[PDB]
Point group: D2
């Protein structure tokens, strides 16, 4: 229908130049797709109540950040328990349940150059409490990441390390830090004090570009909706900053004081949700996909080869979704790196992977709870059907839509190799 | 890894170029072709090439399609030539490395306001003798194609109709002719008499471009190696013409007097084979694939969606082949329209489809004769392994290579929707 | 590497590490982003004009001199506040501060005066206060009018009529502040001299999360039309009370410049805030960084592809001059102009080279601040007897002022744009000159 | 519309091909020069006049055949035929004289030294140097031309594997290149010649140096009045590849249809030039051309850009050595580059550059240099109007310098005709 091609900035998406794409942007072209940039909300006094956390999950919070620069271990353990209680209150309806990751943000090393003794204790707390992600403060070189990895021990091998780049050295040694990290956070608060304030946008755009090229998650953080700590509506510069972080290519956007101590934590999450949806529809996919394809090197890994084939197939038919089965989240991450317009519905049995895939733009995790079928092919199908049924209930899919299904040839992680075109019935 | 020597062969340095101009500058006479020749050679069978022994040499030199010119000879003469082609083809039905399907094409005498009486009788002869293709002379409009189609009677609706464009009217009404035809022949001999000789190259390039866009076979014909009718080596203009027809995007190249009446029919086939191999490696795939992608409209047909995904996947890993299961040849044709560098190995149970897929550039037919397996999934596996084993035998594949496999979810033609990445064991 | 090797040996590796030149050479926008370097210092003069609202904190002659030195190019008078007497005193103080630097072309900096109207209310036509304020503007010789709540082409015709026969030279910049203005944008742009994305009211009239779409669309369409576009309101809002802005604020200023805005504005930051000079300095610092980060390769190609063919010699000469400037890394394009039009046509192709506009019109020197990258030089000398000698003196004036202001250095190449006969509308010549 | 303008507007090369129309007639003057080998079949003054009218721009003398006396008579006949049209200065066509050497045997041969000296003594404009395999071969030819042959253009013939492999060093010291396909097709596999031709044409286009496509282009026309389909395609594809010149050997030297062979190359080249996809070509030439601080180079790109913006009918350039016209030509404008020169040698040599139309200025000098420049500009306009290049109302780009003498081009002006 003509109405379909007038929504989600589709006239602007057809444009032959980026300039014509901008000229075709329409404020009356409503967003259709689900919001794909994850929202990280920092947990504090304004956001610890189980009932308030349920409202934040419904507003769109995907990752709960625990800032270990404030509070004690006892305070953060209660935060974790309240988050888990609010999250599990929706587990009774498995088709609508929303996993929420728990990220520990470290205090950092201060005047010290190595891992501080408090960071070692906080990192061991994180492993003991089952955190999914570590936002490592003031990462300046690859050996800082190795020290964080060592302090997590053998039981914290699955935790994702997102390196916070907050000073000149971190920016200059970016490539070596990215290589050993799972992702990056553009920590603009300290970065804007360590380097001239007028240069932060260059560092943000450079880091987001490099992370997009590497296929690794990148978080844009600090003062995105600062005025919403005390005011019900943000400034024009604030909404523009959120939209531009999404247009830059950020996988995640963050709220600090806006959710930790402000008077409008739920409204701040709703605002980031609303802006991100508008900005994602305004992304010029024609140039973005072409450039991501061109820049990505050749690969002999079947997961990587299947992912590019699936993204290309999704664009060819305007697929509503790519449903992928994943153990560690890696197959969903490799789909996400090509920035499909189609939602990547990741079906997993790993509760940790379901939480961690929120770091990847456009990945919608579904935690499958059913016990395995005796016939492996029947177990793969029931999981694909669970992805379809959840997608229909959540509005991602409708009867008649085309979907791309990404699976593997045998059980266990690392064997994704099949892409299939499926019609929704 | 593949090694530096791998990336110096088959014009791979020129293939990596960021502009067409840089691509030309990087062409290297020392960069040897490795891939199998993908542009089919059509040889006209006549006095100089009728004998079974001579036909065996032409099959070994590279002839894929035997053309019978019904402007000369008689039904009895052409029936003997067809029987001799079939005898030469079946002489290799033992050795798997040597059995190659050869299509039989009937070229009509031509047209009054409809089909000539002799054309009606010759078309009936073609149906009775089981020809695969009809090269229809002097097609001027869509109703000329309908008359040939009607003449192919109740038993020959599977015969491919390749319309010969030989006059101003055929060029002007090209779009309507292409729409109802299976493919096109740029019949340069008569075209060069009907329109100014200096305009033929415009008509050839236009028709090849439009056929490439439509995903339909296009043949470049007449005077390609003309001087080889009397001389053992062609002129510099002749080798250039063959190379340029391949670079233009022709699916097939033809020999007329060169093979029908000249003194060097086998040498003419060998020469076209040598030039086509060199010219295919010099194709600028980066721009070609991007432009085929951009120009091709969105599709909700799973075969078309799977084909673009499979070709994208093949480029990502430098796949040695795309093995496709096809009954009518359509799935192989849809892969061929995206011009993959990988060979498209079409595994079929149909002898007719195996002969007819020679019209599509880069399609290597394998006729499969084993009795069916009771379990359909096992029968599919048996054919995929037939394609892999034939490939290892013919040189295409080695253990450790990656191949793309294209199948459907259920038996019967028209359900292609799966693309799998396999590692050769 | 081969397309920059000879110029790299000549100008040096240090030259090609500054002003985001490695990022400028990139073959894709993604590679361009990856190559952005915080250690690559900006060298070029700041080309996006700063509009500062003059009010209680920025009114004194001494304070205004500090703001002119910090980078203010256009002084905005908000007729939603104050009185005619109050605004006349502000204008006189701006003119006194501006004329305190008139002793030499090396120290002189023309500053435009813009009147921002109160607007219509529930009425669908020009208000009686707007008619009186517009007549005040003509009587006080304002250069620009920022017309509030423009909703259709007839609104700009009403403003034009209220300016009378003596206000024909005043530029009308239509403020787009509601859904109707956005929807009827094309007809408004066609009859306006430029546009202002007035984000404060726009953010109340349409959903706040959609303002960025309207800003990017309007900037893109203005860039395509070759007409000035201003980005306004809350750019450095927190600097009204704090000496440093938020991370969202610096990002917003940089992104308005990257979007393609010709001007950026300060409202409460300079009108009532505690750091008016620091707010101007901050916009100046961010704009210089953001201009160097512009991906000129894609921008120039897209401006070329989208712009239709032209039989106007000024337009033909402008594209040739900008192409020539990119080929040699010209330090400047010196253009002779009467109305500012030849400089505006150069500016629409977004050259990296500074467009030094040499003019005798004091009003045109003030108004060309609306066009990104235009540096106005007011020529005060009486005409030479031979017109060709007069033109040559004006060209040399621009070269000597350019050398003394640091825009030009010995060994630099400059592009000179002039016409074949006197009077407006005859630009048709492009010359390549080496600086000695 | 005419001159393949619908196909020129296309957003992709594939859509450009699809839009090519056999009914879209060429309007622009033929840009690719024709080199005709002068021999027994084309030696007479009367025959040479018909070849000049058919489109011959460069006369090639093959020093592998004949004698010095034979070639001197051929040269005199060419000059006599050329000067028979000098009575009408606004339509006169300069014709270059090129000497093609016999080549080495195993260094520069003694016969080549004598033939090169003959060329200097007879005032040849170009030398097609046979079997160039390294930069030192070009230096030897240059030295054998002596101090009086400093102005002769050396076009290196690439005819073997070594010449192809050492191409970059040969191009660096040569004025241009000839893809000598006859010997190249014997020295390397015949099926690889097209790769060497396309690579060499691409590199010459990038370097801004003339490239000639030669041998067997219309071979069958030695005995037949019409060429084969492969032959017309080969000529069209050499033009589409980017060749500045196309050549005729036996077709004009010993064949039965020398005038028809020239007419055929003229007809094909005109059609192929209109089918060039300028949108991609200009952008790629621009992207690849390095940054430059040379005002002639800077003015040339500005002039070509300005010509495309207004669909200028021509770029009129004043040139002493032909260099300013060559720098315009390297950007492949659709507009004709009308080169107004006082140098008869430069007028002949500038035929090596695609799209350059030389006008030999023989009008009286004006007293004031500025007035003299303006009259040379008006001469280009009047010749253009008479020859069909220009009409009243057209826009032209005029390229001049700031002071007399070679090397000072720095001005581009936009002018409306009449
Ligand atoms: O002499 C021919 C002949 C004689 C007797 C029976 C058949 C043939 C025959 O098929 C043929 C085809 C071509 S062409 O390549 O189609 O032009 C010829 O040029 C010449 C003959
Ligand atoms: O208090 C103000 C004032 C008081 C008395 C006379 C004039 C002014 C005045 O011009 C102004 C402008 C702005 S704004 O930047 O336009 O929003 C303000 O925010 C506040 C004032
Ligand atoms: O993305 P990952 O972690 O590599 O997981 C993908 C794996 O998931 C599967 O699709 C399903 O495997 P399981 O049945 O073990 O869940 C495997 O075939 C595939 O290898
Ligand atoms: O190219 P075609 O003619 O549509 O054939 C493709 C068909 O071949 C298959 O892959 C195998 O089918 P069969 O087992 O019937 O041969 C089907 O799943 C698919 O529909
Ligand atoms: O930019 P504008 O308003 O068109 O003015 C450009 C004009 O200035 C000139 O360069 C010089 O004109 P004046 O001598 O009248 O100042 C003219 O040749 C040209 O027409
Ligand atoms: O192309 P070339 O050899 O540099 O010649 C261009 C020269 O011709 C001119 O346009 C005219 O000079 P002359 O008066 O010497 O003929 C010069 O201004 C310029 O330097
Ligand atoms: O630590 C942080 O989040 C910061 O510095 O912005
Ligand atoms: O009929 C043909 O083959 C021709 O005319 O080229
Ligand atoms: O009028 C204004 O400046 C606004 O609305 O932002
Ligand atoms: O000498 C030549 O011209 C050749 O060999 O092609
Ligand atoms: K912290
Ligand atoms: K026939
Ligand atoms: K106002
Ligand atoms: K010779
Ligand atoms: Mg910090
Ligand atoms: Mg025919
Ligand atoms: Mg307002
Ligand atoms: Mg030779």
């Amino acid at each position: 229908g003509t109405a379909f091609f007038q929504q989600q900035q589709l006239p602007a998406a057809m444009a032959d130049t980026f300039l014509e794409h901008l000229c075709l942007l329409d404020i009356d072209s409503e967003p259709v797709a689900a919001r794909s940039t994850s929202i990280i909300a920092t947990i504090g006094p304004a956001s610890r109540s189980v009932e308030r956390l349920k409202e934040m999950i419904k507003a769109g919070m995907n990752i709960a950040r625990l800032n270990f620069s404030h509070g004690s271990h006892e305070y953060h353990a209660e935060s974790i328990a309240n988050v888990r209680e609010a999250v599990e209150s929706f587990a009774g309806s498995p088709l609508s349940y929303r996993p929420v990751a728990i990220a520990l943000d470290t205090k950092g090393p201060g005047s010290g150059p190595g891992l501080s003794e408090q960071d070692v204790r906080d990192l061991r707390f994180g492993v003991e409490h089952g955190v999914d992600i570590v936002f490592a403060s003031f990462v300046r070189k690859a050996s800082d990441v190795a020290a964080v990895r060592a302090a997590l021990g053998p039981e914290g091998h699955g935790i994702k390390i997102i390196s916070k780049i907050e000073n000149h050295e971190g920016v200059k040694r970016f490539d070596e830090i990215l290589e050993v990290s799972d992702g990056i956070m553009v920590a603009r608060g300290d970065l804007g004090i360590e380097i001239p304030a007028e240069k932060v946008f260059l560092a943000q755009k450079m880091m987001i570009g490099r992370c997009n090229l590497a296929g690794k998650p990148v978080v844009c953080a600090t003062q995105m909706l600062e005025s919403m700590i005390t005011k019900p509506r943000p400034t024009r510069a604030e909404t523009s900053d959120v939209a531009n972080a999404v247009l830059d290519g950020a996988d995640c956007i963050m709220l600090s004081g806006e959710t930790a101590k402000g008077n409008f934590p739920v409204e701040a999450v709703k605002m980031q949700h609303a802006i991100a949806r508008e900005a994602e529809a305004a992304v010029y996919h024609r140039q973005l996909f072409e450039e991501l394809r061109r820049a990505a090197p050749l690969s002999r890994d079947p997961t990587e080869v299947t992912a590019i084939g699936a993204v290309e197939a999704a664009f060819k038919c305007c697929a509503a979704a790519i449903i992928v089965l994943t153990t560690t989240g890696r197959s969903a991450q490799l789909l996400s790196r090509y920035r499909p317009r189609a939602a990547v519905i990741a079906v997993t049995r790993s509760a940790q992977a379901a939480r961690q895939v929120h770091l990847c733009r456009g990945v919608f995790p579904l935690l499958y709870r059913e016990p395995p079928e005796a016939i492996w092919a029947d177990d793969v199908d029931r999981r694909v059907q669970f992805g379809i049924e959840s997608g229909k209930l959540r509005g991602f899919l409708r009867v008649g839509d085309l979907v791309i299904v990404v699976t593997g040839w045998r059980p266990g992680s690392g064997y994704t190799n099949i892409m299939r075109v499926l019609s929704i019935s």
